[PDB]
Write a protein that binds this ligand. Structure first.
Ligand SMILES: Cc1ncc(C[n+]2csc(CCOP(=O)(O)OP(=O)(O)O)c2C)c(N)n1
Ligand SMILES: Cc1ncc(C[n+]2csc(CCOP(=O)(O)OP(=O)(O)O)c2C)c(N)n1
Ligand SMILES: O=C(CO)[C@@H](O)[C@H](O)[C@H](O)COP(=O)(O)O
Ligand SMILES: O=C(CO)[C@@H](O)[C@H](O)[C@H](O)COP(=O)(O)O
Ligand SMILES: [Ca+2]
Ligand SMILES: [Ca+2]
Lengths: 676, 676
């Protein structure tokens, strides 16, 4: 008889009807988690009319297949999502896709569905909130005091990425994070008894999490609310709330794996409706008493945001500098002329490894841009990712840092680092955050990297030791396929800078980015400062480094192979062959230039040879012939590896001469040309 | 004064001298783990003169950067690895690469170095041993009773893949597995206090592992041996032995992160040698008392193998059928004419999804080929990877299966499944093992997949839901980059079969493979049986499906797009354009054919258009123009997605007609031609 009971029924039946309309999707977890969703959203502070309010509590559905539940909450609370949108669940072009997308769904903080990701994103949102609060809060000014609420299931708990992030979140004492395990004993294959018998609670205690168990989460919303209150009292541990639920609660098939991921039968939906007091002939029913009850909570939350806006106005009066910084960040704007801090080099400067140039850039721009934070996956002395004079992000209680710190010790946790970076970006406030590892092990985090791209998050991988140039660690460490993989992923900027100026351009792009993740492929070995490079020119993604009006061939190269191309040009000169050189530090940035610009760099009428010491995949977009490395590497001194594979001035010159011969007497059009 | 002490010193100094000769590598963990390595190898049964003895104990160095330790053991025990090879540590072309490679190093069971992988490989070796023993052991015939010993460090314990595999190994009660944690409190960034403060022991107990703690693993080899004995008494739990060690034990820099990954200073090496009784002027010292002591253990082990060979001879007398099966498997040979079990289709048969065709193949070949085992990462009802009438691999104690079972419930653990598959292959005995998930989430396991390729292991991914064809789950589930990523990786066979006959060819390749991992990209949606397909023709990787002697264009396609290409051919016919069709179910298999065969499929003098509903990367090897999908997908009904992106007979025909126009009046040579 209570409106709470009616709301829970409404949520359950909206979710079931959405799945029924699509004849596709997942009704089980929505039915089991509706009580908890109702309780959690009633405790959350949010404004459906301002999804960007920086002191909102955040909600993350890590078990993203359950998104009919999320969409039902967003509709009932009056986000920019309607019952008509629910009726278009899983339909082409709708705002209710089969897994939630932050780019398409108002109130979806992150893109989830791939299991394990959301809980790690929640760790990142909570990490950002802690850093943000430590940076801006003052006595009598709680600018940031929000919580991060995550729903997750058994699948998320089995995925290693969540173990990584949970270990780290416990270490970081993130008391702002409250996660809820849907303990329903069912996965796709059937009972969890067949593959998942670990003592989850004991594991989470071993990470340093607090635990609250709710033995009847099907009905006991008082206990769920009390569990949230208890979690909030434990300020130095993230909390896991165990929700013991019946998957598909109410269905004839409740408590079975069949209700996990298929639409319910028509008669099942009828009996669900009738026993909960709804009309079995009606779909998408919304009792006005439910939206009125919810509208009241919205009104209270809107009053809280109104007061927060006055708090912020008073803060800007008392702390004009910090307040202006905060306003700028909330407006999405970097500091004026921040890029004047970028290092600039000339050909008179010494050769430097681009991982070391990266260290230098970070040391200059971190002091100038407070919204840069980042870390490394236990490779700080090798990636060179920490700026001297910064403090690590740690709980002060440890003595090892502070929450105001700017450098994160991720440990050996590449995948969670990638998904945590997504959460930090998702927090907002213009965070431009980065994560260091060896390029070859960015691949450990592929699940998260592709979601950076799909989510349009401006995260940055500082991906060092990019090739066989690293030498002795050998083929287990040497990328071959890696750049092809990420360049083939839509919306990833993959920078491979050749020298100091190009490394500054790469960081200019990565930090200015608002919608595109970056991977910066950086060398262990020293590279010369190039004649002809500049930040301005490299900012175009691809540019003419050596212009040769009478070119017999153009060599297009990236990174460490640009200097090699220039040396090959000198060899070719002695053989009577004139070459130009194009440097292509980022293929995506280049692709986005005008057709006329791109054709000025890669014109018609001249054969083009690409040179890059890894896969030739993708390179036929830019070249007629490709010199790359399509086998695994080798353990040895790097110069000897390059000699073995003929990535030498003479070996490049030989293949350039063969390319010129191949096209002798034939017209050649730019590789940029296509039939459609 | 004991020879044990002298052996430990010898091991330590061989490792340090190897690193010193290379001026590259990792001396710290070798110094800390030499006592444990000495103790473990003394308990292990192995034959340095027969690295394939199927009842050997296996050793895995998961902390593979410590490989100077492994190489020192292999040299001292008289494997096909010498002191001269140690002097060439980390040098181009040596048998002592900077991380161990099973393809290059005698006695290296797997390729390790990428952290977390080795312990998961050990779980797989132990899983295979349990299955193998349950299949072949009889009363009085312990054909298989070997153990799997793994060394791992803090890094491995932080990588999520090891959590996945450890949860599963505990569930599977793998009492044959004994792992050793190098608890030295140091990672690359410094103390583990900065990022890794979890209660490891409590976590491993939560998985159901047994624990033995060795508080002084720097010196107490009696306690290490006793820990092994204790582990062997606990037959229903894998055991974690906590080795509390001093990283770099003996170095002036012992117990610091500087000794982790850089050569020791010359004076440090001198004082190490002098205080342990060695000559500081001598490198690569091997006291004859150490190799004599080790040679005795080898002799005992060789006697054990000699007896095992007689046991096996007696087994073949008593159980001629099982014995002949076992002999065949140990010879590396599949059953005679096993491939007669492969299903064959004609164009009169119904349309079938290739994931369903895969189910049918498995149902026919699993009964015929006992060395096939496999599983799914909690997608069994969606991948269709279990053959009816088989039992799950589980401990009998659970009631859910038996160790003789053939179907593995991996849970939602793609990355560990990939690395466990590598371990099962590494066990030997001709295991041909497979793992099912959605293609898009094979990417979660990229770290392990690339090691399958580098290790030359014939594992198979059953990778369903391969494209936008899956429909409503949307872009979080729909591959775009995935095939490009794995095709760009050396030595991966990436099959994308178009119909029944091609799906049988893909399995023929995957099961016959001895050195090449396979990924089978399979559809959710139904595809027609093609006129012109056959197992024989598809076994060539690429073949002419529709031969058109007067072709204006050839359309080359894979998988679901072959039928689309054939329908486009019909549209083109009405526009006066003659097309041929090539089906390219595996690019690697095709690439390995003769140049004349490849040119017969992709000849000179005709424009070639590729069609595949994902990245166009790689396709310029085979086509002049490429029609693919280089943006993310969409949540909707699959046919509507295909229409939106113009993957329709008319849309393909339009781009084919534009391709013909583009080359009108120009000579065209095969894309297979290259200048070098
Ligand atoms: C990384 C990843 N692996 C596999 C899947 C496929 N998948 C979707 S739901 C699911 C089962 C999820 O189980 P659980 O999280 O317990 O959800 P519940 O059945 O309780 O609703 C699986 C294996 C996925 N979406 N992401
Ligand atoms: C997946 C992966 N991430 C990072 C690295 C780089 N790396 C090599 S060793 C190492 C530290 C390993 O620490 P630990 O395993 O504790 O070895 P120890 O310092 O005790 O010798 C790291 C981060 C790697 N090899 N593989
Ligand atoms: O990953 C590893 C070991 O698996 C190595 O790379 C070292 O641990 C260290 O990172 C050496 O790298 P450099 O900084 O000397 O190039
Ligand atoms: O992964 C998911 C949810 O994240 C879905 O794919 C379902 O869990 C199920 O696998 C449906 O797939 P179908 O078998 O109906 O195609
Ligand atoms: Ca579940
Ligand atoms: Ca360590």
């Amino acid at each position: 008889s209570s409106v709470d009971q009616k709301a829970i029924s409404t949520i359950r039946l909206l979710a079931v009807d959405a799945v029924a309309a699509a004849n596709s999707g997942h009704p089980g977890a929505p039915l089991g988690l509706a009580p908890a969703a109702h309780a959690v959203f009633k405790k959350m502070r949010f404004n459906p009319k301002d999804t960007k309010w920086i002191n909102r509590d955040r909600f993350v559905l890590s078990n993203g297949h359950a998104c009919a539940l999320l969409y039902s909450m967003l509709v009932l609370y009056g986000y920019d999502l309607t019952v008509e949108d629910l009726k278009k669940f899983r339909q082409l072009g709708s705002k209710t896709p089969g897994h939630p997308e932050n780019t398409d769904v108002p109130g979806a903080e992150v893109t989830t569905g791939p299991l394990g990701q959301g809980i790690c994103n929640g760790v990142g949102i909570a990490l950002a909130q802690a850093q943000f609060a430590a940076t801006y809060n003052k006595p009598d000014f709680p600018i940031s005091d929000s919580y991060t609420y995550v729903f997750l299931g058994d699948g998320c708990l089995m995925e290693g990425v969540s173990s990584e992030a949970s270990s780290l979140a416990g270490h970081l004492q993130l008391g702002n994070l409250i996660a809820f395990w849907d303990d329903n004993k069912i996965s796709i294959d059937g009972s969890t008894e067949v593959a998942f018998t670990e003592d989850v609670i004991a594991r989470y205690k071993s990470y340093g999490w607090h635990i609250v168990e709710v033995s009847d989460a099907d009905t006991d919303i008082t206990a769920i609310a009390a569990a949230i209150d208890e979690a909030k009292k434990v300020t130095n541990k993230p909390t896991l709330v165990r929700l013991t639920t019946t998957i598909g609660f109410g269905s004839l098939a409740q408590g079975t794996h069949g209700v996990h991921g298929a639409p319910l039968k028509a008669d099942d939906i009828k009996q669900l409706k009738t026993k909960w007091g709804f009309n079995p002939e009606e779909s998408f029913a919304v009792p006005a008493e439910v939206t009125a009850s919810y509208n009241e909570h919205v009104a209270e939350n809107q009053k809280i945001q109104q007061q927060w806006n006055e708090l912020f106005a008073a803060y800007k009066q008392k702390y004009p500098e910090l307040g202006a910084e905060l306003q700028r960040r909330l407006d999405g704007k970097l500091p004026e002329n921040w890029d004047k801090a970028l290092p600039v080099y000339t050909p008179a400067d010494a050769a430097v490894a681009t991982l070391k140039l990266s260290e230098i850039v970070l040391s200059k721009i971190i002091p100038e841009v407070p919204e840069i934070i980042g870390g490394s996956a236990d490779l700080t002395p090798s990636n060179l990712t920490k700026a001297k004079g910064t403090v690590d992000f740690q709980p002060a209680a440890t003595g090892l840092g502070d929450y105001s710190g700017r450098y994160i010790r991720y440990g050996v946790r590449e995948h969670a680092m990638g998904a945590i970076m997504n959460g930090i970006a998702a927090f907002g406030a213009n965070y431009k955050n980065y994560g260091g590892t060896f390029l070859n092990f960015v691949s450990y985090a592929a699940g998260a990297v592709r979601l950076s791209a799909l989510s349009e998050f401006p995260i940055t991988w500082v991906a060092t030791h990019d090739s066989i140039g690293l030498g002795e660690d050998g083929p287990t460490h040497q990328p071959i396929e890696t750049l092809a993989h990420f360049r083939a992923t839509p919306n990833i900027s993959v920078w491979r800078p050749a020298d100091g100026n190009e490394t500054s351009a790469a960081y200019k792009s990565a930090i200015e980015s608002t919608h595109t993740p970056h991977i910066l492929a950086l060398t262990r070995q020293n590279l010369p400062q190039l004649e002809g490079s500049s930040i301005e020119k490299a900012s175009k993604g691809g540019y003419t480094l050596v212009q040769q009006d009478k070119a017999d061939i153009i060599i297009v190269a990236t990174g460490s192979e640009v200097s090699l191309a220039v040396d090959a040009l000198k060899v070719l000169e002695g053989q009577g062959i004139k070459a130009g050189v194009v440097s292509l530090p980022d293929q995506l940035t280049f692709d986005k230039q005008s057709e006329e610009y791109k054709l000025s760099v890669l014109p018609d009428g001249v054969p083009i040879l690409s040179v890059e010491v890894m896969s030739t995949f993708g390179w036929s977009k830019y070249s007629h012939q490709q010199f790359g490395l399509n086998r695994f590497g080798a353990s040895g001194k790097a110069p000897e590896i390059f000699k073995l594979f003929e990535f030498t001035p003479e070996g490049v010159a030989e293949r350039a001469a063969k390319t010129v011969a191949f096209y002798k007497g034939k017209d050649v059009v730019s590789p940029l040309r296509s039939a459609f």
